[PDB]
Design a protein around this ligand. Structure first.
Ligand SMILES: CCC[C@H]1C[C@@H]2CC[C@@H](O2)[C@H](C)C(=O)O[C@@H]([C@H](C)[C@H]2CC[C@@H](C[C@@H](CCC)N(C)C)O2)[C@H](C)[C@@H]2CC[C@@H](O2)[C@@H](C)C(=O)O1
Ligand SMILES: CCC[C@H]1C[C@@H]2CC[C@@H](O2)[C@H](C)C(=O)O[C@@H]([C@H](C)[C@H]2CC[C@@H](C[C@@H](CCC)N(C)C)O2)[C@H](C)[C@@H]2CC[C@@H](O2)[C@@H](C)C(=O)O1
Lengths: 222, 222
């Protein structure tokens, strides 16, 4: 309320834990993205004033990095199937599903390298899966980049699609149908394989798209 | 200037071409991203009023989709090496470099499926490269998703890194050095392979990261 600064002249800390703050920041991020994270509103959600936050972080950017690590998946459960490909796919899939659930993190990782404890443990597990499969260092690094950059690109694309699909309320089949008048005309300038791809796309879904691409990619490594 | 609406009472179209508008929109997008694209400022950059724009598009969203297609790369030059892998890599690399140069498009594609003419031709060329390599339809679709989702994720991550690197003026080697005090402590909770990966990362670069991951990924297809 206006004038409280003057009342302070005639004479209130609210200690918080960092963990409690980060959990509250994840909730605000999940609700409205990086723009929905304002420090004063975060402090309000914890019944506190902004000073309570800055005992623990210097800036909002610090808090974004803590939030990124907080939601990183546990290392994948070693599958026992004896195929390291199954373990790689579990680890990538776990990360994919986290990214879809917390899509604000996707764009942040490239400019805020994830090296917090949960990210280090997950990455260490992927690295060990590949080493125990006798990848040399250069091959390991290449395969790791393929797996992670595939997963990030898939998450970005599918999260963007899902957000638009929610708004417009439109499935893949419905979108192909709505665009059919254009697509029928435009694909006639190219060989049959293009229209055929577009037809098949009407029956695809997020989980299958991600899984099939991941399977394909990992199939041939080694 | 204020009051011009009243002067209109006592008595000016500026025809533009759609192509001219789209080129000007790409320039504004390249300068400042999707937020730097305001219709009035776009019209100002063309010495026109907003009405000139809306003869050609209904909304700014239409203009974003035209801009996405306008910058799509030409289909890759068939390499003649007789290895379809070389042609796939040229096509993916061309798209990667476009995405880095026009990074505003990366997040838009998932919610605005690229089906304009330039995107259709590029995609048709990738599809034909794979068919002529005797991929069946399900395998073709999987490989295509792997290639495109790898390229998008790499572009997102590397563009984010480059934007942060420009600002802070910091190389990969310098970043590993600045974080070394933390990383030395944090990687001691895990096997040697983790610290070794981090050390190797100091000598990586955008072009090599992208190429090595792409090579690795395509190596094993078939
Ligand atoms: C910071 C300077 C070096 C850096 C610069 C490149 C530009 C952009 C890219 O990193 C981003 C920052 C990024 O990390 O993407 C990761 C991945 C998506 C995320 C998710 C797991 C997490 C693991 C950690 C490592 C834990 C020990 N991260 C730092 C490698 O990272 C993904 C594996 C990419 C591909 C290869 C590259 O990382 C390696 C060589 C690297 O670290 O390159
Ligand atoms: C619109 C409903 C169907 C749709 C829903 C999924 C969710 C998100 C993803 O599309 C986005 C919209 C997207 O297009 O990503 C593409 C790719 C990155 C960009 C860049 C080249 C351009 C090619 C065109 C096709 C030209 C004939 N695009 C529409 C496939 O697209 C990439 C290949 C992904 C992986 C597979 C999937 O597309 C196919 C099956 C598809 O179209 O799924």
């Amino acid at each position: 309320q206006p004038g409280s600064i003057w009342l302070r002249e005639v004479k209130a800390r609210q200690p918080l834990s960092r963990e409690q703050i980060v959990q509250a920041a994840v909730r605000l991020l999940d609700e409205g993205g990086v723009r929905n994270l304002r420090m004063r509103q975060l402090a309000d959600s914890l019944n506190s004033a902004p000073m309570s936050l800055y005992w623990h972080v210097s800036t909002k950017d610090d808090l974004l990095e803590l939030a990124i690590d907080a939601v990183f998946p546990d290392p994948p459960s070693r599958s026992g199937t004896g195929d390291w490909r199954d373990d790689i796919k579990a680890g990538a899939t776990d990360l994919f599903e986290v990214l879809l659930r917390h899509s604000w993190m996707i764009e942040l990782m490239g400019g805020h390298p994830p090296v917090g404890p949960r990210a280090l443990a997950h990455t260490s597990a992927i690295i060990e899966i590949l080493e125990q499969a006798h990848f040399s260092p250069r091959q390991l690094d290449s395969a790791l980049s393929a797996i992670y950059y595939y997963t990030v690109g898939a998450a970005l694309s599918e999260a963007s699609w899902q957000a638009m699909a929610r708004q417009s309320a439109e499935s893949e089949e419905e979108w192909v149908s709505r665009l059919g008048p254009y697509l029928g005309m435009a694909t006639q300038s190219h060989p049959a394989s293009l229209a055929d791809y577009v037809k098949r796309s009407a029956s695809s879904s997020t989980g299958q798209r991600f899984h099939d691409g991941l399977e394909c990619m990992v199939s041939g490594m080694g």
